[PDB]
Structures are given as C-alpha cells and as structure tokens.
Design a protein around this ligand. Structure first.
Ligand SMILES: Cc1cc2nc3c(=O)[nH]c(=O)nc-3n(C[C@H](O)[C@H](O)[C@H](O)COP(=O)(O)O)c2cc1C
Ligand code: SF4
Ligand code: SF4
Ligand code: SF4
Ligand code: FES
Ligand code: FES
Ligand SMILES: [Zn+2]
Lengths: 47, 263, 22, 83, 210, 87, 426, 106, 80
C-alpha cells in the first residue's frame, strides 16, 4: 500500500475496526423500513 | 357461409371474411410478436414488428392490418419473417435508453421479451442515441418518455376508449415525441389504463414507482368494491401488503380496464 | 408580383363558381 | 436517524436490541453526498453519463438537458448536468 | 417540440382573424365537403400565419375553435409540417436550398455568402429581425440549381454575388425583381432550346375522329 | 449449435423397432429424442419382461441399471412415470 | 430510340413562350374536343388510357389505365373524387413545376377529361405550399375556365358537373405519398395509411378517390385527342409515350425537355440539355429518377437508356425521370449522405423501420464521409438498408435504402479508401 | 466516489440469489431517486455463490475480500443495508483494487 | 400482451397469515401449502386432484377474449 497508495473517495473510513462482536459496538440487526399500515388514532376530545 | 379457409402453416383454419392475418394465427394458436396492436384499440401499423410472410408473395405483410384472403399460408416462422423481426428489433432497441434497472416495467416489458424471444442477441448501433424531454402529464402517470417506441396506443386509447383526445404526436422524423404539445395534465377517469397499455415503461405509475418488481408480486384475483360496476381486478401483493391493483379481463364487466379510483 | 392573400382571396372569388357542396 | 428516518418509537421494544449495543448507522448519507457534487454545465443538448469508469461504472444513458429550467439527472449516479 | 409558455409566446397574446380573414376562412371551409370542416386546418392555420408570422400557441388555439377541432390536432399539424414558423420570424425569411442537386451546383457558397452578408449565422435572425436565415431542403426549382426562397418568392439560378445584390435591394427598397436573375427563361436549355424551337400546334391537329 | 450425428438416430431408431417387435405385448411407444436417446415406453405389466429381454439378449445386452426415477405429472391420471435408464 | 419532334410534343408552352393563360391555350387548342370526349363516357376514356400504355408518370409508374379503372366500379352512394398531387418533392423534380406554372390549363382539362373517366364529382390539386406563386397561376387559370363554363356545372357543354379546387401543401415531401396526400387533404397529420384499405375503396373522406402525378392527368386529354396509338407508338414496348426529362447538376445546360421515353441516357444529356460538365468522361455517376432511385455509374449508363423496363433491368428506377449528374469532382459519399439527411429531416416517423433506420444510416453515412468508420461497417449498412427496404409502411423507406445500396454496389472501393485515409493519419 | 450509494434497487440481485438470502424493498427517495429502503443479506442463508456480484448492473453489491467475520450471535450474521454500506466503506479501497484487476476478465 | 401464461389451468390453495417478523421485518408465514401452486392441463384433471386429496375446490370457468372485428379501413370512415 505504501508503494501504490490506494484511491481515497471522501467517504471511506480512516479508522477501520476489528471484530466488534463481543464488544458493545456490534451490529444488532434491525428492519430499516418505516411503518406500513398507519392506524386511526382515537379522537382525544371526548364526544 | 362467410367462412374463408386460410392456412396458417398449412392448418386450414377457417375465418370470417375480414379477419386480419394476426387474428388467423391466433385461432391456430400462434402469436405474431406485436407492438401498437391492442385488441380493443384501432389497428395502426406503426411498429411493423408483426411482418409475416404469406406464401408465394414478394413482400412480407402486416399481420395486424392485412385482411386475410383465401388460400394464403402465413409462414409465420419462415426464415424471412425472422429477419423481418431480427431487423425491426434492431431498430426499436437502437434509440432505446438502457435503464431497464430503472424501468419498473422490468419483467412487465413486451419489448425485452419480444427481444429475448424474437430478436437478436447483440447490437450494431455504434452511433449515438436520442433523448426526449420528460413531461409532467399528471400526478398518477410518470412519463419517462425517452422510453417511448412511438407505438401510438396511448393516442388511440386516449381518444378511442376514453374520449380525452388530448395526447397526440408532435413533429416528424426521429424526434416525433407523443406528449401533450402544451403541458396540460391528462386528467380523466380511465387515465391509469395508459400505464397498463403502454408496453414500454415510458409512462408508468408514479405511486407504484419503485416499490417492487413484478416477478416477486403474488397475484390474487379479486373484485372492485369502489364502484358498483364490480370490475374484475388482480391485487398484486408482496410479503403481505398490496403493492398494485391492475385490471384482469372480464368480457361483460370491465374488459381490461379499471377506474382511476380503484387502482 | 402577388399578395399574401392572392391564393385565398382569389379562391373566395371562385366560391361563386364552386359547384354546390356534397 | 438512518437514511430513511428509521427510528424505533420511544415505546418499541426492538430498542431492547440496542440496549448495551450500538445501533449501526452510517454518518455518510447519500441524499446529501450527491447534493455536494455540482451541476455539470455541458454544452450539448444531450450528454451521456456512462457512470464514470466505463465498464466499471453504470449502464450508459443519454440525458436531455433541453429543458432550460431544470437539470438532467442520471437515474443512476444522481449526477446533474445543465446546458 | 414543447411549448413552454413564455410571456411573449403564450395565449396572453390574444389572436382573432381580422373580419376579412374570417371571410376568407369561410370560403376555405366551403371547398371541403360539408361535415368535414376539420379538413381546413392547414389552410386556415396558414392564414393565421399570414396574419401573424409568429403563429403563437394562441393562434393555434383559435384555429381549433374556428374549425371546431380538438386543440391537439392543430398542434400536430403545426409541429409536423415545416412551413409553419411556430416562433417569431424575420420580415424577409430567406431560405437556402441545400439538397444534393443545388449543392452539386455549389449551393454551399450561397449560404456562406448569406451568412456574412447577413452577418447572422444560419438558424438565426438579424438583430433588426429583417432577415432570418434557414437551411431549408429541396424547394423545387432544382433545375435552376443555385436557388433560395426569400419569403414567398423564388429567387433562382443565383450566383453568390447576385444574392448580395438581392439582399441589398431588400435592405433598401422592396420587390427586388423576384425570379431567376440570369438570362435563362425559366427552365429552358441555357444555351438554346433543344426543342420547342418551332411554333406551337393548332386546335384539332392529328385528332382521331371524335 | 451442437453437432448431431444421424448415425445414432438411425441405429437407435432401428433398435427401437427391434425391441418393439420382440416385445409387442407391452411396448406402447418407442421414440428417439432429438438428442439421440431411445425411450421405449412399456405398459406397467411389462416391467419384468422388457427389462429381462434387454438384460439377457445377445443382440441387446443392457447389463447395468444407471437409474430408476419417477417424475410426477400431477395432471396425468397415472401420476408417476417410473423411468429406468440402462447401459 | 428518341428524337421526338416538337410537333409531336405535348406541352408546347413548356419554357413558356406562349401565354400560359387561356388565350395562348386556345391557340394551342387544348380545349378542343373536351365536350365530345366526356360525351364519349368514362369507359371509353379509360380504355384509351389502357391503349396508351401510359404508366404512372409519377413515382412508381403503375399502369395508369388499370389504376384509374379501379374506381370505374359503380358508386356505392359516396361521391367519387379526383386528387392530383403536385407536391413535386422528389429532389431533382422541377418536371411538374412547369405544367403547373407554364401550362396550367392543360392540367385543368386533364382534370375533367380524367374526371369523367373515373366519374369523379370533383378534383383537388395539392400544389406544394412552397410554390405560392405557382398557386397564384393555376386558380387564375381555373377561374378563367369556369368563367368560360369549361368546368363547373354544365362543364364545357356536358351535363357532367365537375369542380376543381387547389389545396395548400406545407413543405412536406411525404405529403406527396398517395395515402398521405389524402390525410393532408383530410386535415390530419400527413402520415401514410396502410394499403390493405386501398385508396379507391377508402377515399378521402371515405369516398372513393384516385391520385395521379400532375403529368399523368395533363397528358390524358391530349392522348384521347391524339389517340392511344399515336402516344403508344413513341415508347418502347411496355414503356410508352414521351416523358419529360429534367437533367440537373454537372451538365452544361440543365433543362427540362420532354423526349421519347426509352431515350438513351448517354444521348439525353448529349442532345437536349447539354454535355456532361467536363466531357462525358467526367461522369462519376447519375441518378436517373431522382434521389429515391439508385445512381448508376458511367460504364452502365450510355449502354442503358431512360425507360422504366430498361432501368429495372439496370437495378434503378425511372421514377420522376430527374437526371442528377455527378462529375468526378464530387464526394459521392457526401452527395448520397445529404440525401439521407434529406430523408431524416423528412420521414413521418409513423413506422419503426424508417424512423430509426433512416436516422441510423444518416449517423453511419456522416461517419463514412469523415472516414472515421471501419471498412466492416460498410456491409453492415448494406444489411441495415434491406431491413428498411421491405419492412416500411410506405415507399419512402423503400426510397432511402436504394441510394445507400447504390453507393455500396458501385463505389465500395472509394468508401474503403476514405476508411483507409482516416486510419493512416490517426 | 461522489457518495451516492450505487444500488438503484433493480432487485435482480434478489431474483438471481440461489438461497433467497437478499431481501429488498424500495420507494422513491425524496430526491426522487430510486433507492432501497431495506436491503438485508442473510449471510447464514447466503452460500457465497458470487452471482449477485455478477448480476448487479451498477455493480453495487460486491463480494468483498474479508472472510473473517465470525460472530458470537446468530443475529449479528443477518446484515441490513447499514452494516453492508459500512462494510462497503471500510473495504472500498481494496474492493476497488480487486474489481480493477478483474473487470477486463468479466 | 403475451398470452402464454393464460394457457394451463392452475389450482392454488387459499392465502393465509403473513405477519411481520420482529427482528428483521421480513414477512413470516405459518401456512405450508401457501407457495404451492400445482399446474394441471385440463379442468377435469384438476378437479380430480382436489377430490382424491380431499381439498375443497371452487372451479372458475376459463374466460377467453371474445372475437373482435377489426379492419384498418374503418378508421377512415366517411361518418363513424
Ligand atoms: C415519399 C414519397 C414521396 C412522393 N412524392 C411524390 C410527388 O412529389 N409527386 C408525385 O406525383 N408522386 C409522388 N409520390 C408517389 C405517389 O405516392 C403516388 O404513387 C403517385 O403520385 C401516383 O401517381 P401516378 O399514378 O400518376 O404515378 C411519392 C411517393 C412517396 C413514397
Ligand atoms: S422498456 Fe423499460 S424495461 Fe422494457 S426495455 Fe425499455 S427499459 Fe428495459
Ligand atoms: S407512450 Fe407508451 S403508448 Fe404512448 S406511444 Fe409511447 S409507448 Fe406507445
Ligand atoms: S444491488 Fe446491484 S442488483 Fe441488487 S439492487 Fe442494488 S443494484 Fe440492482
Ligand atoms: S402490430 Fe403489426 S403493425 Fe404494430
Ligand atoms: S434541391 Fe434545391 S431545388 Fe430541389
Ligand atoms: Zn450518472
């Protein structure tokens, strides 16, 4: 990498990390899609 | 009486006088590759992708527009009628913008398939392509019209099935663009059908822009409840939420069309 | 020498001669 | 929070997942990163965005920069070009 | 081919056939079969151009109403044919024929002459809007190959200089002897009639009985 | 386009007729694919007889059973299509 | 053979020299037996046409008699019509501009003589809008004729009633096409229709109609007057009569002169018109029928003569018989290239093969003139050419393919060198 | 390089995955661009065929060099768009070099 | 506009629950016979499969496009 340095693209990380699995930094899978069926919230004003 | 006998590859089908060459192939069961011909829309002959070869005839004929005549043999798969498709598909594709992974009529394209089935494997158009400015025709139909194969089925539907008579061809040459000359939205019921009827994905649905891709959509056949015509419809569901409702054909009730409300 | 309306106006003059419409 | 405003509600329990752990998100968001790139002022009605790098880029497409008001944007890169 | 409404070119520009023009429009409609007024689109649209060279979107709309035809139809005709301006056009509007027949007889020279003579490049118009230069296609009159159509007239068989002369005539004064400005009469053999030298024939000649 | 020798489509075709003639009580159809493969079709009762003739006939020795499989065409009344490939 | 006599020529007013107005026409005696002819009846007139052997005279030379005859079938309650195309667009054609401008009357009586042959209620003349002045001349002539009562009700003493109209063209070559002239007359966009509903069957305004080159309508009264035989004698076999020849480009005296059809080409330029500029040796190529027909190179030319049968043997079309000549001083690759530019700026775009195909050849042809394209591309354009030739809705795609085919057929070595020239300088 | 994620949600990476691993659902982003709201590669389902690398038109999904991603919990192996995009940012320099070396071959 | 997928009869089991999965949001189904669609060439054969397997059936008659008369001439009709 010293001889032919790589291409820098102004998003690539500068601090790369090792396996963070046992440490709290670990990926915890989650759905990234937003809600699908919005619901009718009840009127808060007493009828 | 009134039953000519025409041979589709020597099958002696018999058809009422008046049936087109494309129609003769249909009753035998063969399907002429076709663009710009819709059963419930007037024959226009714009694409010429249906050229077939009646036997003992110098030139190939336009299937969708040629009244069949007694004795004719269609030779639909004749070496000639394949050059007459291998060479048309060369042209439709030449000016086409390859954004098939943008075109949400990805698997719902009658132009890739008719190209994967009836056309060539490569291209020779080393020249440059064209681009046509898009149009905000409305809030329902997204017209990325650089996709248009100038097949004039919209201009027909928009005049014949619906009485809008707004969409029209403008200009001549390779920059004939089929969009409203002045920017007036295509506001009418029956509007969304243009999506379903444009085989190209030039103008498609704006709400269902990029939510899905057709192979995934599980298709359940059900009934329109928004209006009392009870139009037949197919609800396309992916992973359990409805993604699109598009018409399914019922001769008597909705013959391939559905309202702007119920889709 | 002819005017921009020569064709049209001449025609209108011919209208009288023009045989009855279909 | 995430690219799509994916933020578990204050009461959702998948937040337990994030308890004692990092909810992985990326600071670099595309919606913003493309904006930074300036509009390319080409001098031809129709220009092509091969995607940068030819075969190492995206399918080639031609954009019509004719509309004087707006700017053409490659359906792929998002790069914008104006005449 | 898109009309993006502009203050100048948009319906705010009101259009209406002068009373006389409307009379003309009526005759035009009479020619065609009754119940087929729509057929008079081209003729009427032209009349509009005669009235206003610009032929603005408003004009197109008027044509439609006058002929009770869908507005789009008028648009299609206007955007299809080429003799319709669809924009403002120069008082003179010269058009230079550049098909192979003319080019083979050096049409390109004429165009170049005009470009600097006019001082304006093709596809563009002079500042005074007096002259608009367009590279039009075969205008007929190919025999007199070097040829250009200034407005309606057909100036033919022109050598580069001749045009400059014509343009000057147009620039100061009017009606610059429109036609082939060379000795040849129409499309005759330039040197001498190769035929039709003798007097014409007479009525009944070599007529089969009845 | 694959190279096809019609020598085989002729040899195999003939054999098909030979088998059929020798075992007409069970052979219903005998076809050769365009891929030069013979596929005698036998009534289920001819399982024992047709195989045995092929295993032990001087002019057709088919000693080893390559495979026994059963496609399932649900539409077909007789659902399964036991296929025995021999070498 | 050739050498028609001026006496036996048809448009004596050609080149003007005689009042194009009626008076000059009366000395010409053009309106001499018009009442009698119409009195003869539709059939007799059409018959004379067949005897004449007169072919199209316009673009494709279909037998005129048979064609016109197709509408001699009984009326089905729709008024039959006459359409006389005067678009005269084919590059190199000033052939028609003459009859219209110089001898308007000949065409006026051509119209009614032709009209009773088809029993047309009325005739519409579509003169190209470009020719505004030309229009001025004909309706002055048409106005004279009715004033006389030659046309209109009681036409020339005949109970026949025929009305003649002039329609403004709007700068379109395609308007010229038979199904498209109609649509322009109908007022829609000028886009051809398919032939299966033939023009006679579905007419303009759904009323049987027929379309003729103005030359074809103009000669019918004189041919009836002179009889089919006199006319049929001048031509060679099937090819018959004398067709006007317009020679333009690289000839000493470019002019339109009518001569016996079947006149040798080396001779046409030699006897009328004028010598090939720079000597007959300076003839790279000539396109006999105008831009649509394939050009023929010099060695083939003098051998062949100008008649449709001889030309089809030669692989080229008589067409409008517009002779365009190219000296050895011209870049043919660029000459034909502008004709493809002539067709991209003009085809309607209704049909897929012409729309993209003609634009595709234009792009390749421009590269060919530069020499940027490689040698293998040249036969590629061959193949693109025939895809367009048999697949198009109208004939213009037929027409665009032929010049491309001619350039590859006879000038393939020159294009390869232009290929080579650019590759060498890199 | 600008910073716009390459994927345009054509979703044929999902179509050709042999194991049904990739799940993609998309919607037009506010910019108006096409983008994937959720892209989930289930690595335990994935059999690392490398067809997704093959199929992508923009080549947004790539087979990265790292093989050492063993995880204590099964959930960590399931990967959403944010982990993969982060994986992409970390290894982009080598991925670019690797694609640079092998693209002529493909 | 292709009709090659409207040729063979198919019998499809009734659709069932597709609840969202909490950890990843993937669709989850508890019905085994959901994705199964068997294809049968003729209506009679498909009915037979339901009877011997004991599943309830409700056959829908094929509906094929009715013949439609078309002719390019009409579009140029004197009075339409
Ligand atoms: C693109 C195109 C342009 C044409 N232009 C003309 C023209 O300018 N004049 C003409 O007489 N015929 C023209 N034709 C031929 C006409 O369509 C028609 O065949 C002819 O006018 C019939 O006349 P005829 O019977 O006298 O030959 C053209 C055809 C095509 C395909
Ligand atoms: S239409 Fe959309 S999908 Fe069909 S080919 Fe053109 S781009 Fe690809
Ligand atoms: S929009 Fe769709 S339908 Fe209308 S023309 Fe272009 S392609 Fe044919
Ligand atoms: S990854 Fe490549 S293929 Fe899969 S969607 Fe994003 S872009 Fe299309
Ligand atoms: S379907 Fe035959 S012309 Fe388009
Ligand atoms: S080409 Fe210029 S006159 Fe026909
Ligand atoms: Zn881009």
């Amino acid at each position: 990498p010293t001889t032919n340095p790589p291409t820098a693209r102004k998003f690539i990380w500068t601090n790369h990390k090792f396996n963070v699995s046992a440490t709290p930094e670990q990926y915890v899978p989650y759905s990234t899609t937003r809600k699908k069926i919005h619901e009718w919230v009840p009127p808060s004003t007493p009828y | 009486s009134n039953l000519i006998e025409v041979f589709v590859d020597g099958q002696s089908v018999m058809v009422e006088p008046g049936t087109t060459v494309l129609q003769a192939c249909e009753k035998v069961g063969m399907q002429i590759p076709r663009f710009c011909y819709h059963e419930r829309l007037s024959v226009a002959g714009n694409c010429r992708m249906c050229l077939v070869e009646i036997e003992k005839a110098p030139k190939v004929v336009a299937a969708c527009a040629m009244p069949v005549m007694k004795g004719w043999n269609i030779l639909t798969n004749s070496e000639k009628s394949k050059k007459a498709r291998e060479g048309v598909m060369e042209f439709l594709l030449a000016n086409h913008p390859l954004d098939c992974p943008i075109c949400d009529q990805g698997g719902e394209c009658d132009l890739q398939d008719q190209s994967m089935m009836f056309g060539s494997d490569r291209s020779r158009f080393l020249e440059g392509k064209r681009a046509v400015e898009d149009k905000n025709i409305g809030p329902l139909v997204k017209t990325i019209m650089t996709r248009c194969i100038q097949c004039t089925r919209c201009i027909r539907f928009a005049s014949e099935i619906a009485g809008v008579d707004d969409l029209g061809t403008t200009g001549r040459g390779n920059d004939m663009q089929v969009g409203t000359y002045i920017e007036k939205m295509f506001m009418s019921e029956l509007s969304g059908n243009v999506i379903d009827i444009c085989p190209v994905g030039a103008l498609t649905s704006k709400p269902y822009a990029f939510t899905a891709r057709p192979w995934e959509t599980r298709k359940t056949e059900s009934i329109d409840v928004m209006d009392a015509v009870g139009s037949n419809i197919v609800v396309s569901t992916r992973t359990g939420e409805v993604m699109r409702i598009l018409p399914r054909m019922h001769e008597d009730i909705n013959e391939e069309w559905i309202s702007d409300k119920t889709r | 020498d002819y005017n921009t309306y020569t064709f049209l106006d001449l025609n209108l003059d011919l209208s009288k001669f023009r045989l009855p419409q279909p | 929070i995430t690219h799509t405003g994916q933020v578990y509600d204050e009461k959702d329990y998948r937040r337990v997942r994030f308890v004692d752990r990092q909810k992985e998100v990326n600071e670099n968001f595309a919606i913003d990163l493309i904006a930074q790139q300036p509009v390319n002022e080409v001098e031809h009605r129709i220009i092509a965005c091969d995607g940068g790098g030819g075969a190492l880029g995206h399918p080639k497409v031609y954009i019509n920069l004719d509309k004087e008001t707006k700017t053409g944007t490659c359906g792929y890169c998002g790069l914008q070009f104006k005449q | 081919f898109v009309h993006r409404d502009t203050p100048e070119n948009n319906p705010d520009t009101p259009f209406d056939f002068t009373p006389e023009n409307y009379k003309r429009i009526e005759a035009i409609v009479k020619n065609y079969p009754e119940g087929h007024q729509a057929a008079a689109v081209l003729p009427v649209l032209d009349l509009a151009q005669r009235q206003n060279g610009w032929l603005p979107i408003s004009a197109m709309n008027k044509v439609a109403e006058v002929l009770q035809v869908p507005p789009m139809r008028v648009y299609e005709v206007a955007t299809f044919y080429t003799m319709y301006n669809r924009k403002p056009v120069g008082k003179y509007h010269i058009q230079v024929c550049t098909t192979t027949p003319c080019m083979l007889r050096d049409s390109d020279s004429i165009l170049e002459t005009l470009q600097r003579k006019l001082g304006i490049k093709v596809g563009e118009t002079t500042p005074d809007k007096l002259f608009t230069l367009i590279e039009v296609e075969c205008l007929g009159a190919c025999v007199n190959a070097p040829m250009v159509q200034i407005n309606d007239n057909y100036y033919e068989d022109l050598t580069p200089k001749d045009i400059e002369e014509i343009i000057d005539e147009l620039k100061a004064g009017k009606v610059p002897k429109p036609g082939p400005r060379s000795g040849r009469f129409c499309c005759e053999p330039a040197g001498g009639l190769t035929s039709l030298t003798e007097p014409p024939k007479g009525p009944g000649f070599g007529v089969q009985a009845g | 386009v694959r190279p096809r020798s019609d020598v085989t489509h002729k040899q195999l075709s003939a054999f098909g007729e030979y088998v059929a003639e020798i075992l007409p009580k069970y052979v219903q159809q005998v076809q050769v694919s365009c891929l030069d493969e013979l596929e005698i079709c036998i009534h289920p009762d001819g399982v024992i007889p047709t195989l045995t003739f092929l295993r032990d006939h001087t002019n057709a020795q088919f000693k080893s059973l390559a495979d026994l499989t059963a496609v399932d065409v649900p539409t077909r009344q007789n659902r399964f299509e036991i296929v025995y490939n021999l070498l | 053979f050739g050498s028609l006599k001026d006496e036996d020529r048809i448009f004596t007013n050609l080149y003007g020299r005689h009042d194009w107005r009626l008076k000059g026409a009366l000395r010409r005696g053009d309106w001499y037996k018009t009442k009698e002819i119409l009195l003869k009846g539709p059939d007799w007139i059409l018959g004379e046409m067949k005897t004449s052997g007169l072919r199209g005279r316009g673009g494709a030379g279909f037998p005129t008699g048979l064609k016109w005859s197709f509408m001699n079938k009984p009326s089905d309650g729709r008024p039959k019509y006459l359409v006389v195309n005067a678009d005269e667009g084919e590059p190199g054609t000033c052939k028609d501009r003459e009859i219209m401008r110089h001898d308007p009357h000949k065409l006026v009586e051509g119209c009614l003589v032709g009209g009773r042959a088809m029993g047309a209620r009325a005739a519409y003349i579509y003169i190209r809008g470009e020719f505004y002045n030309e229009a001025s001349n004909l309706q002055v002539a048409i106005r004279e004729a009715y004033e006389a009562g030659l046309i209109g009700k009681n036409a020339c003493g005949s109970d026949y009633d025929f009305d003649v109209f002039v329609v403004r063209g709007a700068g379109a070559y395609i308007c010229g096409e038979e199904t498209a002239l109609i649509e322009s007359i109908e007022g829609k966009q000028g886009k051809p229709r398919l032939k299966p509903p033939f023009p006679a069957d579905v007419g303009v305004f759904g009323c049987p109609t027929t379309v003729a080159n103005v030359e074809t309508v103009a000669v019918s009264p004189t041919i009836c007057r002179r009889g089919g035989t006199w006319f049929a004698g001048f031509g060679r076999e099937r090819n018959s009569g004398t067709k006007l020849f317009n020679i333009s480009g690289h000839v000493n005296h470019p002019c339109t002169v009518e001569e016996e059809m079947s006149v040798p080409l080396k001779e046409l330029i030699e006897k009328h018109a004028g010598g090939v500029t720079g000597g007959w040796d300076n003839l790279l190529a000539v396109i006999p029928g105008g831009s649509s027909t394939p050009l023929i190179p010099k060695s083939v030319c003098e051998t062949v003569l100008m008649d449709f049968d001889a030309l089809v043997q030669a692989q080229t079309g008589l067409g409008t018989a517009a002779v365009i000549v190219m000296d050895r001083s011209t870049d043919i690759v660029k000459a034909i290239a502008r004709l493809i530019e002539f067709y991209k700026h003009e085809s309607c775009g209704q049909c897929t093969p012409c729309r993209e195909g003609v634009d595709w050849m234009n792009k390749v042809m421009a590269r060919f003139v530069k020499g940027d394209a490689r040698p293998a591309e040249i036969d590629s354009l061959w193949e693109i050419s025939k895809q367009i030739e048999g697949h198009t809705i109208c004939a213009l795609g037929d027409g665009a393919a032929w010049p491309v085919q001619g350039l590859i057929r006879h000038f393939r070595p020159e294009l390869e060198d232009r290929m080579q020239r650019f590759a060498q300088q890199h | 390089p600008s910073g716009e994620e390459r994927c345009i949600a054509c979703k044929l990476c999902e179509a050709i995955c042999p194991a049904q691993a990739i799940t993609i659902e998309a919607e037009p982003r506010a910019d108006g661009s096409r983008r994937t709201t959720r892209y989930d590669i289930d690595m335990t389902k994935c059999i690392y065929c490398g067809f997704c690398q093959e199929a992508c038109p923009v080549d947004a999904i790539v087979e990265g060099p790292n093989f050492e991603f063993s995880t204590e919990t099964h959930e960590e192996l399931l990967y959403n768009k944010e982990k993969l995009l982060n994986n992409g940012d970390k290894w982009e320099a080598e991925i670019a070099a690797n694609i640079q070396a092998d693209y002529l071959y493909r | 506009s292709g009709v090659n997928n409207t040729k063979k009869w198919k019998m499809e089991f009734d659709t069932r629950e597709r609840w969202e999965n909490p950890l990843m949001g993937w669709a989850s189904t508890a019905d085994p016979l959901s994705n199964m669609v068997l294809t049968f060439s003729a209506k009679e054969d498909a009915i037979a499969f339901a009877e011997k397997n004991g599943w309830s059936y409700d056959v829908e008659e094929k509906k094929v496009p009715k013949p439609k008369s078309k002719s390019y001439g009409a579009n140029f009709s004197w009075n339409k």
